[PDB]
Design a protein around this ligand. Structure first.
Ligand SMILES: O=C(N[C@H](c1ccccc1)[C@H]1CCCCN1)c1cccc(C(F)(F)F)c1Cl
Ligand SMILES: [Cl-]
Ligand code: NA
Ligand code: NA
Length: 546
């Protein structure tokens, strides 16, 4: 009755843009483009986005908006399959715990960059070794030694915690305080903040791109980026890497979209917004690639090498590679400040949803007016429980546990959840009723291109992603470190804490549904319950209730 709505469509579009666009469009996409084809990777990138990225986004947005419920209350089409919803909250917990620990290396670097001389420029600090060979000395760069010997003192084993790094506990406190203070009212509070932490990164990117373009030696760094190698598109690996990147980057099956769309009005165009956001998210990765590769080309020119020795994948690029290249520009503590501010803003627009997704559930599932008057207390209850649970990741052996949670927990549990949820709404509920349900909202039948892509093509692409992820599984390794057996076992058990919630809840539900034959018990608890439909009595007309 008092759930509330957004108020402006611009708020919803900006919030979704800031939630989908995260840190995966800055360090992941450029390296993939450089490695897998060059300028010929965009053909598999933009062909597997039309047939796999837009249909899934549209289906999730239309599913969330119809029944004005979060990621846990929309499963009234088949109450037995509610284990999928509980699978969307476990994974969103993991991505809500280790994401704030990445915010130290953006906050700590930002706070340590307010100096007239960058601390990682010259190799004369007492924490250095004999291999300080760099470029700015008046092979080991003096940004890697700072990264692994002063910011975090890396140990020699995953189970070798030595002490908690207090400067990192400081960021975690500050960051959780900011996250809680920015969600003090929810929709009426975050909706007015996304006007800032969704657009400033574009200004920062434009400034950095201009500086890179006018910089000498940059045109040789953009040629390697987008020169076509058409041979690569003839392989199956390139078509298997352009399907996983689209699926993961769009933010599919973490919840969020189903809980953002739950606040929209009933008669809202879910087709225009499903295309605008999808195109905007995929049009930022190219710009980020340009920005990164211009300065990388300048760096390679300065050290007089081909651009193959100065390319890094993840945290080794944003903290070991890019900062080591910004130190050659005239006014470095300003470009570094802007870059780390952009990283902080990019990583902070996603954490808002990962806290509001878990609050909306716990609020609506219980069901009361007492749980609505004290939503801020609930929001504080989850923030202080994500700070105590993220302390072990700030110790000496923090990087080891950081990479084991992003490669096992939220790696293939997401693909399984989406595949099952596709089957649940298409062939169990019925693909002939969902089309009429969507037509009731949009006002026109879905385009024919979307009916053939929702029943045959997209599930096939999901199956292809699932199969390709199994044939190309290798044990996780960090640099030359080899993870022991117990770490792999812990990671596998972590990955089994989300996809194992579907069979258990199904058994629990069918162990209490009154029936005679198991086929009849399966027949029940799989039909829409008598609460499926619009939440307002003014919209219920025709097929759904008198
Ligand atoms: O950004 C990262 N993964 C993203 C992701 C998205 C969704 C879920 C999980 C992970 C990628 C996955 C692949 C497709 C594009 N998005 C990443 C990479 C290396 C190290 C780290 C660290 F160290 F911070 F954990 C991270 Cl967080
Ligand atoms: Cl991407
Ligand atoms: Na983001
Ligand atoms: Na992302």
């Amino acid at each position: 009755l008092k759930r509330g709505n957004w108020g402006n469509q611009i708020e919803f579009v900006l919030t979704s843009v800031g939630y989908a666009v995260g840190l995966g469009n800055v360090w992941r996409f450029p390296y993939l483009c450089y490695r897998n084809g060059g300028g010929a990777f965009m053909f598999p990138y933009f062909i597997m986005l039309i047939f796999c990225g837009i249909p899934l986004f549209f289906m999730e947005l239309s599913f969330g908006q119809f029944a004005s419920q979060g990621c846990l209350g929309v499963w009234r089409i088949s109450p037995m399959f509610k284990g999928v919803g509980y699978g969307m909250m476990v994974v969103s917990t993991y991505i809500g715990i280790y994401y704030n620990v990445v915010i130290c290396i953006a906050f700590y670097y930002f706070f340590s960059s307010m100096t007239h001389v960058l601390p990682w420029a010259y190799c004369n600090n007492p924490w250095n070794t004999h291999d300080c060979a760099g470029v700015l000395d008046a092979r080991t760069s003096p940004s890697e030694e700072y990264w692994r010997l002063y910011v975090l003192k890396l140990s020699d084993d995953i189970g070798n915690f030595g002490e908690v790094r207090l400067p990192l506990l400081g960021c975690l406190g500050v960051s959780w305080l900011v996250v809680f203070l920015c969600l003090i009212r929810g929709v009426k509070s975050s909706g007015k903040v996304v006007y800032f932490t969704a657009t400033f990164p574009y200004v920062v990117l434009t400034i950095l791109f201009v500086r890179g373009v006018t910089l000498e030696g940059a045109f040789d760094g953009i040629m390697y980026y987008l020169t076509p190698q058409w041979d690569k598109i003839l392989e199956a690996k390139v078509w298997g890497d352009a399907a996983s990147q689209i699926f993961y980057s769009l933010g599919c099956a973490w919840g969020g979209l189903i809980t953002m769309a739950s606040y929209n009005k009933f008669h809202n165009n879910c087709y225009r917004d499903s295309v605008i956001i999808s195109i905007t998210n995929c049009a930022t990765s190219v710009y980020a690639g340009f920005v990164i590769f211009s300065i990388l080309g300048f760096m390679a020119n300065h050290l007089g090498v081909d651009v193959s020795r100065v390319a890094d994948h993840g945290p080794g690029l944003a903290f070991v590679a890019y900062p080591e290249a910004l130190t050659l520009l005239p006014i470095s503590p300003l470009w570094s400040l802007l870059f780390f501010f952009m990283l902080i803003l990019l990583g902070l627009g996603t954490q808002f949803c990962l806290l509001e997704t878990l609050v909306t559930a716990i609020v609506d599932e219980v069901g009361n007016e007492w749980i609505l008057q004290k939503k801020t207390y609930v929001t504080l209850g989850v923030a202080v429980a994500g700070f105590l649970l993220g302390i072990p990741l700030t110790s000496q052996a923090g990087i080891y546990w950081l990479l084991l949670m992003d490669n096992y927990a939220a790696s293939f549990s997401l693909v399984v959840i989406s595949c099952i949820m596709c089957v649940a709404i298409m062939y169990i509920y019925g693909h002939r009723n969902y089309f009429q349900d969507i037509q009731m909202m949009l006002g026109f039948p879905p385009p024919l291109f979307f009916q053939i892509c929702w029943r045959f093509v997209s599930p096939a692409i999901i199956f292809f992603i699932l199969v390709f992820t199994v044939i190309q599984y290798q044990p996780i390794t960090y640099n030359h470190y080899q993870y022991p057996g117990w770490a792999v076992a812990i990671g596998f058990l972590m990955a089994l804490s989300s996809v194992l919630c579907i069979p258990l809840y199904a058994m629990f539900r069918l162990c209490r549904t009154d029936g005679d034959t198991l086929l009849q018990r399966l027949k029940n608890a799989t039909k829409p319950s008598r609460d499926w439909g619009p939440a307002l009595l003014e919209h219920r007309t025709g097929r759904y209730a008198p």
